Design a protein around this ligand. Structure first.
Ligand SMILES: COC1=C(OC)C(=O)C(C/C=C(\C)CC/C=C(\C)CC/C=C(\C)CC/C=C(\C)CC/C=C(\C)CC/C=C(\C)CC/C=C(\C)CC/C=C(\C)CC/C=C(\C)CCC=C(C)C)=C(C)C1=O
Ligand SMILES: CCCCCCCCCCCCCCCCCC(=O)O[C@@H](COC(=O)CCCCCCCCCCCCCCC)COP(=O)(O)OCCN
Ligand SMILES: NC(=O)C1=CN([C@@H]2O[C@H](COP(=O)(O)OP(=O)(O)OC[C@H]3O[C@@H](n4cnc5c(N)ncnc54)[C@H](OP(=O)(O)O)[C@@H]3O)[C@@H](O)[C@H]2O)C=CC1
Ligand code: SF4
Ligand code: SF4
Ligand code: SF4
Lengths: 71, 328, 153, 382, 318, 24, 129, 178, 177, 96
């Protein structure tokens, strides 16, 4: 058998049997990423302290002015 | 019977029983005996399907088949006793319930199961279970009913064994478990009548071992009303003395004259009156259990005892009462 | 009439069927499948099922995996401390019946030997949906309770 | 002071029954109790053929299924001399490696749920329910895929499985990154894991750790680089090896080993030869349904292979693969008959859970669940 | 009286917070939470309740009824009485105490009793030591909350909570003292247990860590207490630091500016932050936790009292 | 208790592969 | 100059060469107590002499490793000290010599094993550097 | 193989193989001494006791065969030292050399019954607590002797009665002509 | 050594505007706010959940669920009693008794698969020569009682006729393998 | 004080509410369904001390415009003594 299970009309020979099974497409798949691409594009060490310090510098002045208005 | 096995839990014993009172304190030991010696048990339950769940185990894959049935409706009792050769009857109440009265739960049922088993010709052994001292003219209406039940199960169906177990002790019982959880009223135990009652309790395992022993016996134990008394004829006070040995508590009894008790149990006796509400099952103070408590007739006379079953009961100290440790 | 009893049973059953927190005796892989049935795809927190880590407060107990003869006393001791309206689900072949190890000396032939079981999730590695359908069958078993009608006899 | 520390969260570590002899909060000794999951596996396999023996292996380690079938298959090919094709090897690795991912996705985030991080568990379990769409598609059962048979592998991949495994591998670097961004940077994680269960290499060797707990300590020892048992000698991948040994190194490894396993999956996908699925030796591999029905000599073998078995020749070998837990090896003495003879299963978690005694000495009682975390203790193998 | 109008809606708030936590913490995990019981799980809290109520006890044990059957009552009564002074809008506080804040501090100092007693009546050495550890944690992040409130008090004139929320008309104390809000939140997380800081609340060690006689009522009351204590300690991060009932003051045409709705929005933000921060962070182990309340949130709280006192004394902003 | 405390300091994260990156 | 052995626990030894010379001289001196016509003494003598020689010739630990291709000098010290333990152990319960009966059945099964099966491949030769 | 030249000839007493993993079937007396060799030796450095596989040959005279596997992480090789000890022969324990041998030898004694000499804490690890009998022997029936466990009137307790189950169906697949 | 290791691992980060970077990360949680941000991104993203009873998880034609004894299109149970599945069964779930029926062609008087004592490995589907026993994709057959879970002799496994419309489909699509 | 009466009745009405929440489960569901850890004394004494010093913070907090720059420095001296105590406790190692 095995030439009556995989017919492929013609083929003249036991080789050239159909042989259609699963696999990667011709040319493989896309290059798959595996590294750790963690983007560190956030606020830096400064700009976070200076936003906090800047908020403290101006916002506490605003607390003071609000205390003046309340008084 | 047609036994093909070695021990149980997969053997056969030709006993396809229908333990009518299986979903009950006596029932769980009797069903375990009948289905650990390898025999089918057609446990019929009355209401919530959670009642016989604790019996789907202790029997191997259909050795225990819980079935639904209405107590007052026949053609369902006949369906429960369709494929059966043994029919034990544990259906009994110590308290009147608004729907089922003392006779409609102790006598008018046992007579009904007796008749519908007689009709279903093939019930080889029909055991009828009633309390000891359940003879007519007993004060407690529960015992008069349970006496009429014996008289009607023997008449309507002769050669029907009748066990007479006295108050049965064991886990989840109605005799010791109410006293504890009332010792949880700060050691206050209200032994009624002053403990002059003389009653012979018995480890429920041994009552079950007797109920099965009258099945495994020969043609004898048919129509012979046993009295499953037990050892060590006690008194209520003395039995309470043994509880306090298991549950670590200091004996702090009180005596209650019978008028005081019957007045304390005068409520919960309007069961037929308070229709739109069921009462919470009087545990310790039961006017009928008190009427039984009065006369110490709960002692085994010269009638058949455990000795006529090649059986000797366990004591009431040690393991056969070690269910009280869960109260320490 | 009886209609009020029918509706109070419908209400009690809706409660006990909506919030049914099981003590998941997750022994073995059927606990990994049970974890998939608790995971993101088949939510069990959707159906109210909250996997309790303690037997003390739990409506159910989804015993899964091979109940070993040594984990039989522990399973029984855990089942004895669940509040009375409890149910047990057997999940996987090893937990419901003898299973791949029916003839193993150390394996009990199904938890039906230790705890009384109410719904046997079938399939040795039940699909996570299959355990979920077993729980949706336990919900039916609740919806058929009518405990109030039986308390009124 | 003895404390019966049991399963903190059931359904995660099932039958964990330690008996900790503590000192206040500092643990002085941890005595694990085994046998609560001791099914008769090392006895039941002596009673069944070499084919019936295979399903026990997916049930040995329940979070990394096919790795043990692959360790058994390689122990009934070590005896049979049963040369399997190239496609069988590539599929067998593409699923042993998908299983490494299925295990680290569980043994990281179940560990991370014992530590306290609740969300990585559910993200990783969505990932695992994507990989069980491959297990369940290639064999049938989502968990116990009795698929890696002795000769080759049970049956070929469906005609759409490599495309789906690719569409998964493309999106799996991001899932590892999320599992990493949520746990690696956290100061509540490092604090819960750094210098926890540190195992000097001499200890990891002594106690036969041989897993991700032998590459924490820094012993470069992977049985895919040491004893390449498949296309592994062709596939390129770097074995991450720790430098301190603390439970924070073993986590970082298991989260890199989950990327190198992604490399191996992508390679096995990109180079999977269209060859036969099972060994051509039809006296070790049951012939296909089509052939046994049409060919009388194939029908005889399908009958004597699904009833009698192989009858692998008399020998005794210890075939050990790198299962995710560790060096899972199945010492398979084989009497000449068709049934094995003392198919002893060396399972890591029997050697790792030994390490709990010395790993969790002087660690606080709340660390004893972190140790059990990083050991990947699955009690099926113990 | 009108105490019903602050306890019943708070009971509903806690019952629906169990669902809000399950549902938000589930949405975080890419999964819908309780979703079958009600239209959107909205009846799921009632289902949990009506289940816990209909669960038969494991043992009646009504004998020991004065020891630990009123200790959950005490914890819950404290968690509910600390709601009097909390103002929801201008003139909506039930009882404007001119020392309101110190009264909240005292209510916490009595919640310590609640925990200790309800843990001692549980005759379980492991559970009692767990309750003692939880009390020591709740009381060690109380010196830090104390000093944080001393900061927000220096900024304000008086302890009157209606004044502390009226002293923010110009700017919420969340903007200048943001580092303090982060410390009050990370303390309110740790004062209550529900947090990255809940090793005594590690899933298993919590249930076996408060009592032995559950009967369901104890389990619900502790969780109802924890969730009210959480609604409260989130209704403090929104009085002190966020503007108690103040808008951003842009005065929109679309927005008619209801007060209690703004207080509600902000306490919802902080409850959602409780949930989010329970989902995304590992537990602290109670041995790094107590070493974070003393070595991290006490120095960084003391510094803040000296910083917000200095910067307000030099420039006369007081 | 003199038990060795878990010092949460260590060396910085540097992914350490094996020497077989390029040519075994 | 060596920063650290990648292995945990095997602490880097600065005086690697000196303690190696010490250990190999101790080993050569202690091995004399076993009979000469025993494979164990020929082996110990030969490899201890080779490593002691290469340790005396070269100076840096790196050159010791490079020529004596046996991993790292810390692991080499572990090996030498373990060898000293073994020689001091072998002196006791002396197993040297062969009793008259000496039945030792060498068994050889030559079945080829399939290539795709765990086979412990040799690994890199000391041209790793 | 280098290991056989240096090893004292008496230690590899009975047998020696040369494929499917090499083994030194030694004698029980020279075992821990043989395990002392192959470890703490410069050219043979195993250090790693992978496994201790009890194997029961009922037809032998020395029934069991305690198969010590051994990996050599240094030289990348694996040696399987074996022994032979019947039911009542205490065999030397190698927990002192490889501390992983503790649990493996507890399992070998539990399954088989090959007690181990000077093994601290030699206690049944796998089988049940009150387990009598040694399972992984050959003469131990699969279903066990008394190993059914069911609940009963002895509440909260699972008894251990004699066993009864659907009979394990042993199939005689083995064909003639081998 | 740990003392010197600490001294050096803290003298690695010892240059101003690096001590400041690390201080800021500890002072204002940076790694932790990256945890909260990711968690939020997942709080708002669509949910990978499945309201089960109405839609169910994806399966495959090779899926092994409830065992079903197939039939030949023209009635006649496909199960000739060879007992190959009773032999191949790892858990020995299938108990087969055979009797020459009156027609003369062998058939199984008793074909009882014990589902509880069954591992669902699909060995029976492979071993059966005529595809008589196959696993239907049912997998939803949780039974209230254990006795029902023991699938009777050729009567409940004969309910595969209902599942034949799906079993025939799965076989027509899997037979290529 | 006048505003203390609402919380005075609050305690009692919340007592009633909790008693009802207690009695609700009790009514339904009828018949048918370490020697010493001294660190807990150190943590306790230390909370006592730090809550005493917060008690001293409170009046200084609410009255800091009155005490212009002298009450502030006196409180900072009190706080430097607090800090010396707290540093002696940190170094000695009571915070563990
Ligand atoms: C730390 O981790 C944890 C989890 O992890 C995710 C959890 O899940 C939870 C959360 C789970 C719980 C159950 C906690 C406790 C919460 C509750 C039980 C909810 C409380 C609800 C209420 C206050 C309601 C109480 C009573 C009700 C609703 C019924 C009263 C009235 C009636 C019966 C009449 C009903 C009739 C009609 C028609 C409607 C009116 C906890 C505690 C936990 O600890
Ligand atoms: C960028 C904005 C950040 C906002 C963050 C919001 C988060 C809120 C919700 C809760 C988040 C998670 C809670 C985690 C609890 C643990 C936090 C913690 O204690 O972290 C470290 C401490 O973190 C904190 O205490 C954070 C509190 C910040 C308060 C302000 C810090 C300094 C402010 C400087 C102000 C500058 C201007 C002032 C003068 C002009 C502890 O140190 P470690 O052990 O992690 O590592 C170092 C060990 N030595
Ligand atoms: N308990 C004792 O101490 C003593 C009892 N006995 C007798 O032993 C027998 C069994 O005792 P025990 O099990 O403790 O008794 P229970 O009162 O607990 O009832 C046992 C069984 O009787 C059934 N039953 C009772 N009344 C009815 C009814 N009206 N309709 C239907 N079923 C009913 C119960 O059904 P359900 O559970 O659904 O209500 C249950 O199955 C009874 O005859 C009893 O009187 C003998 C000596 C004293
Ligand atoms: S029944 Fe099957 S899937 Fe379930 S635990 Fe047992 S082996 Fe695992
Ligand atoms: S899948 Fe088939 S062969 Fe395997 S155990 Fe189940 S019934 Fe038996
Ligand atoms: S199901 Fe298949 S193997 Fe079983 S008897 Fe029928 S044809 Fe034979």
């Amino acid at each position: 058998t095995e030439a009556m299970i995989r017919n492929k009309p013609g083929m003249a020979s036991v080789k050239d049997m159909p042989l259609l099974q699963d696999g990667p497409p011709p040319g493989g798949f896309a290059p798959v990423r595996y590294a750790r691409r963690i983007s560190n594009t956030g606020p830096s060490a400064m700009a976070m302290f200076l936003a906090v310090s800047g908020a403290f510098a101006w916002g506490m002045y605003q607390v003071g002015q609000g205390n003046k208005i309340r008084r | 019977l047609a036994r093909k096995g070695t021990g149980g839990r997969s053997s056969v014993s030709g006993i396809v029983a229908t333990v009518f009172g299986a979903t009950g304190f006596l029932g769980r030991y009797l069903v375990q005996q009948l289905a650990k010696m390898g025999s089918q048990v057609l446990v019929p339950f009355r209401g919530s399907e959670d009642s016989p769940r604790h019996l789907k185990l202790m029997g191997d894959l259909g050795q225990v088949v819980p079935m639904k049935f209405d107590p007052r409706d026949e053609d369902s009792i006949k369906a429960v006793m369709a494929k059966a050769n043994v029919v034990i009857n544990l259906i009994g109440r110590e308290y009147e319930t608004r729907n089922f009265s003392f006779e409609d739960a102790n006598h008018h049922i046992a007579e009904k199961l007796a008749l519908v088993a007689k009709e279903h010709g093939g019930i080889m052994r029909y055991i009828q279970v009633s309390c000891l001292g359940a003879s007519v003219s007993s004060p407690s209406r529960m015992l008069r009913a349970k006496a009429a039940a014996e008289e009607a199960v023997l008449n309507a169906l002769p050669e029907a064994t009748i066990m007479r177990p006295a108050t049965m002790i064991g886990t989840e019982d109605r005799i010791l478990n109410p006293w504890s959880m009332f010792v949880k009223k700060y050691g206050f135990l209200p032994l009624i009548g002053g403990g002059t009652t003389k009653f012979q309790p018995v480890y429920v395992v041994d009552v079950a071992a007797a109920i099965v022993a009258a099945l495994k016996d020969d043609g004898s134990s048919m129509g012979k009303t046993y009295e499953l008394g037990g050892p060590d004829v006690f008194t209520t006070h003395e039995l309470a003395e043994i509880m306090y040995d298991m549950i670590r508590e200091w004996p702090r009894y009180v005596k209650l004259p019978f008028p005081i008790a019957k007045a304390m149990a005068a409520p919960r006796d309007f069961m037929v009156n308070k229709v739109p509400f069921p009462l919470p099952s009087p545990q310790i103070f039961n006017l009928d259990q008190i009427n039984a408590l009065t006369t110490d007739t709960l002692v085994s006379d010269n009638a058949l005892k455990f000795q006529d079953l090649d059986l000797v009961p366990h004591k009431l100290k040690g393991y056969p009462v070690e269910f009280l440790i869960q109260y320490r | 009439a009886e209609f009020v009893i029918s509706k109070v049973d419908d209400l009690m059953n809706w409660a006990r069927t909506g919030s049914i927190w099981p003590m998941t005796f997750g022994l073995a892989c059927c606990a990994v499948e049970m974890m998939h049935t608790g995971a993101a795809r088949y939510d069990l927190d959707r159906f109210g099922i909250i996997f309790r880590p303690s037997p003390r407060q739990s409506d159910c107990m989804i015993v899964a995996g091979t109940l070993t003869n040594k984990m039989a006393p522990a399973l029984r001791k855990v089942y004895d401390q669940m509040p009375e309206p409890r149910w047990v689900i057997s999940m996987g072949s090893c937990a419901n019946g003898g299973g791949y190890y029916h003839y193993s000396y150390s394996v009990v032939r199904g938890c039906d030997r230790i705890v009384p079981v109410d719904i046997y999730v079938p399939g040795c590695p039940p699909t996570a949906e299959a355990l979920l359908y077993g729980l949706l069958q336990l919900q039916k078993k609740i919806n058929r309770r009518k405990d109030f009608l039986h308390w009124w006899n | 002071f003895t404390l019966n520390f049991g399963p903190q969260h059931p359904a995660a570590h099932g039958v964990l029954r330690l008996v900790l002899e503590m000192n206040g909060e500092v643990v002085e000794r941890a005595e694990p109790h085994i046998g609560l999951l001791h099914r008769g596996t090392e006895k039941l396999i002596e009673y069944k053929t070499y084919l019936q023996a295979l399903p026990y292996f997916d049930r040995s380690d329940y979070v990394s299924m096919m790795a043990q079938e692959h360790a058994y298959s390689l122990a009934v090919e070590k005896l049979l001399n049963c040369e399997v094709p190239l496609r069988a090897q590539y599929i067998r690795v593409l699923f042993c490696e998908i299983t490494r991912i299925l295990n680290h996705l569980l043994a990281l985030t179940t560990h991370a749920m014992d530590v306290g991080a609740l969300t990585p568990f559910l993200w990783a379990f969505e990932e695992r329910e994507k990989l069980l769409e491959f297990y369940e598609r290639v064999s049938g059962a989502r968990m116990h895929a009795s698929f890696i048979r002795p000769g080759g592998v049970a049956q070929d991949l469906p005609l759409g499985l490599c495309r789906d495994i690719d569409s998964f591998t493309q999106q799996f670097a991001s899932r590892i990154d999320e599992l990493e961004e949520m746990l690696t940077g956290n100061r509540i994680w490092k604090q819960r894991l750094v210098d926890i269960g540190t195992v000097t290499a001499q200890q990891a060797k002594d106690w036969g750790f041989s897993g991700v707990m032998l590459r924490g300590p820094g012993v470069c020892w992977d049985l895919r680089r040491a004893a390449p048992y498949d296309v592994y000698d062709q596939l390129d991948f770097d074995v991450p090896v720790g430098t301190r040994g603390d439970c924070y190194d073993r986590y970082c490894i298991r989260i890199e080993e989950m990327r190198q396993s992604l490399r191996i999956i992508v390679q096995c996908l990109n180079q999977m030869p269209s060859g036969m699925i099972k060994a051509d030796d039809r006296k070790l591999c049951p012939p296909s349904r089509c052939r046994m029905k049409l060919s009388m000599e194939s029908s005889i073998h399908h009958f004597e292979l699904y009833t009698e078995g192989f009858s692998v020749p008399a020998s005794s070998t210890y075939t050990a693969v790198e299962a995710p837990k560790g060096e899972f090896g199945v010492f398979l003495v084989s009497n000449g008959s068709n049934r094995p003879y003392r198919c002893k299963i060396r399972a890591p978690g029997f050697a790792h859970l030994q390490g709990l005694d010395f790993m969790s000495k002087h660690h606080m009682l709340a660390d004893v669940v972190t140790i059990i975390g990083t050991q990947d203790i699955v009690f099926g193998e113990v | 009286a009108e105490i019903l109008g602050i306890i019943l809606p708070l009971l509903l708030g806690v019952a629906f917070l169990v669902l809000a936590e399950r549902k938000v913490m589930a949405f975080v995990q890419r999964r819908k939470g309780p979703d079958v019981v009600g239209s959107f799980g909205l009846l799921q809290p009632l289902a949990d309740g009506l289940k816990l109520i209909l669960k038969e006890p494991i043992s009646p044990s009504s004998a020991n009824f004065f020891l630990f059957r009123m200790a959950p009552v005490a914890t819950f009564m404290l968690s509910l009485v600390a709601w009097a002074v909390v103002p929801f809008d201008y003139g909506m506080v039930l009882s404007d105490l001119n020392i309101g804040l110190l009264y909240l501090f005292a209510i916490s100092s009595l919640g310590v009793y609640g925990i200790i007693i309800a843990g001692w009546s549980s005759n379980s050495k492991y559970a009692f030591l767990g309750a003692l550890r939880s009390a020591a944690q709740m009381v060690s992040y109380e010196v830090s909350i104390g000093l944080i409130l001393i900061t927000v008090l220096i900024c304000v004139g008086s302890c009157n909570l209606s004044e502390i929320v009226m002293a923010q008309k110009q700017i919420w104390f969340g903007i200048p003292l943001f580092p303090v809000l982060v410390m009050f939140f990370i303390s309110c997380l740790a004062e209550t247990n529900r947090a990255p800081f809940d090793l005594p609340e590690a899933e298993a060690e919590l249930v076996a860590g408060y009592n032995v006689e559950y009967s369901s009522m104890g389990f619900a009351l502790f969780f109802l207490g924890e969730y009210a204590n959480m609604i409260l300690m989130s209704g403090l991060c929104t009085l002190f630091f966020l503007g108690g009932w103040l808008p951003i003051l842009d005065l929109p045409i679309f927005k008619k500016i209801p007060g209690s709705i703004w207080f509600s929005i902000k306490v919802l933000f902080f409850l959602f932050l409780y949930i989010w921060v329970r989902a995304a962070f590992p537990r602290y182990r109670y041995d790094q936790l107590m070493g974070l309340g003393w070595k991290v949130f006490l120095p960084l709280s003391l510094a803040w009292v000296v910083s917000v006192s200095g910067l307000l004394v030099t420039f006369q902003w007081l | 208790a003199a038990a060795a405390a878990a010092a949460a300091a260590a060396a910085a994260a540097a992914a350490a592969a094996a020497a077989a990156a390029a040519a075994a | 100059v060596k920063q650290t052995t990648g292995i945990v626990g095997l602490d880097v030894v600065p005086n690697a060469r000196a303690v190696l010379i010490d250990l190999y001289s101790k080993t050569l001196k202690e091995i004399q107590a076993v009979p000469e016509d025993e494979g164990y003494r020929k082996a110990v003598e030969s490899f201890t002499r080779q490593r002691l020689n290469v340790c005396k010739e070269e100076e840096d630990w790196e050159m010791i490793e490079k020529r004596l291709g046996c991993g790292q000098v810390e692991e080499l010290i572990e090996e030498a000290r373990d060898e000293l333990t073994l020689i001091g152990k072998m002196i006791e319960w002396d197993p040297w010599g062969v009793p008259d009966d000496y039945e030792c059945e060498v068994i050889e099964n030559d079945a080829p094993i399939p290539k795709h099966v765990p086979q412990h491949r040799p690994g890199p030769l000391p041209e790793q550097f | 193989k280098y290991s056989w030249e240096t090893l004292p000839k008496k230690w590899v007493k009975k047998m020696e193989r040369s494929e499917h993993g090499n083994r030194f079937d030694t004698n029980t007396d020279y075992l821990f001494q043989l395990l002392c060799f192959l470890k703490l030796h410069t050219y043979t450095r195993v250090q790693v006791l992978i496994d201790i596989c009890g194997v029961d040959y009922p037809s032998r005279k020395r029934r069991f065969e305690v198969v010590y596997n051994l990996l050599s992480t240094r030289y990348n090789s694996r040696i399987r030292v074996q022994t032979s000890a019947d039911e009542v022969t205490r065999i030397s324990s190698v927990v002192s050399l490889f501390p992983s041998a503790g649990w493996w030898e507890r399992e070998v004694w539990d399954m088989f019954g090959v007690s181990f000499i000077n093994h601290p804490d030699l206690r049944r690890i796998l089988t049940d607590y009150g387990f009598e009998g040694h399972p992984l022997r050959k003469d131990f029936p699969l279903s066990g002797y008394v190993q059914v466990r069911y609940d009963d009137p002895e509440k909260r307790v699972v008894s251990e009665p004699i066993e009864m189950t659907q009979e394990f169906r042993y199939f005689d697949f083995a064909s003639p002509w081998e | 050594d740990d003392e010197e290791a600490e001294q050096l691992a803290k003298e690695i980060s010892k240059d101003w505007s690096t001590v400041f970077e690390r201080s800021m990360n500890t002072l204002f949680l940076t790694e932790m706010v990256r945890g909260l941000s990711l968690t939020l991104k997942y709080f708002f993203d669509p949910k990978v959940t499945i309201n089960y009873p109405f839609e169910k998880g994806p399966l495959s034609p090779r899926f092994r669920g409830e065992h079903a004894l197939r039939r030949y299109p023209t009635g006649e149970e496909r199960c000739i009693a060879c007992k190959l599945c009773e032999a191949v069964c790892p858990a020995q779930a299938i108990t087969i008794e055979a009797e020459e029926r009156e027609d003369g062609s062998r058939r199984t008087t008793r074909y009882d698969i014990d589902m509880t004592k069954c591992i669902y490995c699909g060995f029976c589907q492979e071993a059966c020569p005529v595809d008589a026993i196959v696993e239907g994709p049912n997998f939803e057959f949780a039974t209230e009682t254990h006795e029902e879970l023991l699938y009777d002799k050729e009567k409940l496994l004969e309910n595969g006729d209902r599942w034949e419309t799906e079993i025939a489909e799965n076989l027509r699509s899997e037979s290529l393998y | 004080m006048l505003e203390f009466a609402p919380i005075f009745i609050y305690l009692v009405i919340s007592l009633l509410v909790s008693l009802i929440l207690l009695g609700v489960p009790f009514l339904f569901a009828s018949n048918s369904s370490s020697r010493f850890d001294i660190r807990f004394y150190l943590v306790s004494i230390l909370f006592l001390i730090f809550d005493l010093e917060v008690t001293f913070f409170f009046p200084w907090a609410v009255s800091l415009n009155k005490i212009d720059l002298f009450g502030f420095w006196s409180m900072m001296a009190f706080l430097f003594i607090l800090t010396i105590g707290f540093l002696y406790e940190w170094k000695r190692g009571a915070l563990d």
